[PDB]
């Protein structure tokens, strides 16, 4: 129950690469500076937008036909891998 | 079709005959299944003698077509499909540090009996091990078998693995692989990706003396219609933990948890954890009387688990905390029915 005073800014800044930035901004981000979770909202949000998503099999994200194969370079992936998905995150943006 | 065979109460009888080390056995077991419910009500003895294996060992081993398949996964359910003609299920259990199992099974009706005959060999059992030591407390988990389609032999695969609780404290893990095949060249069902949750009461007869198992087990099964949305926001706090115990490398800590219910020095206790991006892995135990504490490898030499009868209370001292022992850590006992203590976060730096 202890908590520690002051809290610490554990959130991670980054900057995404151009690619990775078009995409963000294609759903509604603003933005060039963006924290971790948010980059992740605004890409699921993306994937859902452009229905991306298999509908029988959720977790098949298909991208052989949309910008996203670009960005993580696969045509299709398994959110259920969440190593090989953080990686292909990582490679299109830096920690600012 | 098959799944009318199974609305209501089915008799059930069950056939092993087991030569494990060269010593041998057989097993017989009658009872009831009512796959609605997905309810097991069964009685087994040991018709040659008594056991040199014990019974959690078989439990596996000693009818998944009485697993309860709610409506929208009823175009799942292998096991049903292949009745009345039987399907065929061969399995390799694989005691770690320890012999192998191997069966081979053939479950179809006979009359209107939903019957078993299995057939099991076992290799590679230290005489002085935890098997034919019988070292096993006398329980079942919960587990989870994950089931997958296998199309060329029209029948389904299926991984996992069984935790048996050594008395010790020590868990011993028991790795299924298995494989199910119908008999009849008629039509079958092959599955989406899914799981059956299962539960097991182990329990004994008074007024019977032949070495015996009464055995109560649920069975559900689940999996195969999970939202994007959510197997998104598993990977994103995935990747954004933020933690709920955090320290440095180095340092110390002090896991409390507090029993409801049961008198925990009564029951052996243990405490597991899941890593990000792991399987929860048995940390340390102790046996109920108190006299043994057991504790995994990576832990040894670091983690003290003790327990305060009057505060009913469960204690985990942890020391020279690594970052790999960063991970969601919870407390286990098993009082017929497998129970887990609420997970606790410890993220160290």
């Known amino acids: 129950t202890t908590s520690q005073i002051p809290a610490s800014e554990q959130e991670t800044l980054v900057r995404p690469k151009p690619l990775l930035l078009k995409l963000l901004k294609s759903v509604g981000a603003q933005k060039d500076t963006y924290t971790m979770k948010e980059v992740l909202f605004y890409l699921g949000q993306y994937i859902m937008t452009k229905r991306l998503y298999d509908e029988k099999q959720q977790h098949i994200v298909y991208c052989s036909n949309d910008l996203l194969g670009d960005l993580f370079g696969v045509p299709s992936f398994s959110v259920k891998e969440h190593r090989k998905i953080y990686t292909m995150i990582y490679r299109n943006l830096v920690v600012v | 079709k098959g799944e009318e065979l199974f609305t209501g109460v089915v008799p059930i009888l069950v056939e092993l005959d087991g030569d494990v080390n060269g010593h041998k056995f057989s097993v017989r077991g009658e009872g009831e299944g009512d796959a609605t419910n997905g309810k097991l009500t069964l009685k087994f003895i040991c018709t040659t003698g008594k056991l040199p294996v014990p019974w959690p060992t078989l439990v596996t081993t000693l009818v998944q077509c009485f697993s309860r398949y709610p409506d929208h996964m009823k175009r799942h359910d292998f096991f049903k499909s292949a009745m009345p003609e039987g399907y065929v299920q061969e399995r390799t259990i694989s005691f770690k540090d320890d012999g192998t199992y191997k069966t081979r099974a053939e479950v179809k009706f006979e009359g209107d009996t939903l019957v078993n005959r299995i057939e099991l060999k076992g290799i590679d059992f230290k005489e002085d091990g935890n098997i034919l030591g019988h070292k096993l407390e006398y329980n079942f988990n919960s587990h989870n078998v994950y089931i997958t389609a296998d199309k060329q032999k029209n029948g389904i695969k299926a991984n996992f693995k069984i935790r048996h609780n050594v008395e010790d404290g020590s868990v011993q893990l028991a790795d299924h692989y298995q494989q199910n095949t119908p008999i009849g060249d008629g039509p079958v069902l092959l599955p989406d990706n899914h799981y059956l949750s299962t539960q097991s009461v182990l329990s004994k007869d008074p007024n019977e003396k032949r070495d015996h198992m009464v055995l109560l087990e649920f069975v559900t099964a689940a999996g195969i219609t999970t939202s994007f949305a959510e197997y998104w926001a598993l990977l994103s706090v995935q990747l954004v933990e933020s933690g709920g115990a955090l320290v440095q490398p180095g340092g110390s800590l002090r896991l409390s948890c507090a029993a409801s219910?049961?008198?925990?020095?009564?029951?052996?206790m243990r405490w597991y954890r899941q890593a990000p991006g792991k399987e929860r892995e048995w940390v340390a135990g102790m046996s109920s009387a108190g006299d043994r504490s057991s504790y995994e490898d990576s832990v040894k030499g670091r983690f003290t688990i003790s327990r305060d009868d009057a505060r009913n209370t469960v204690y985990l001292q942890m020391n020279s905390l690594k970052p790999e022992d960063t991970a969601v850590y919870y407390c286990?006992?098993?009082?017929?029915?497998?129970?887990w203590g609420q997970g606790t976060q410890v993220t160290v730096s």
């Open positions: 219910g049961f008198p925990v020095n009564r029951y052996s």
């Open positions: 286990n006992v098993n009082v017929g029915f497998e129970y």
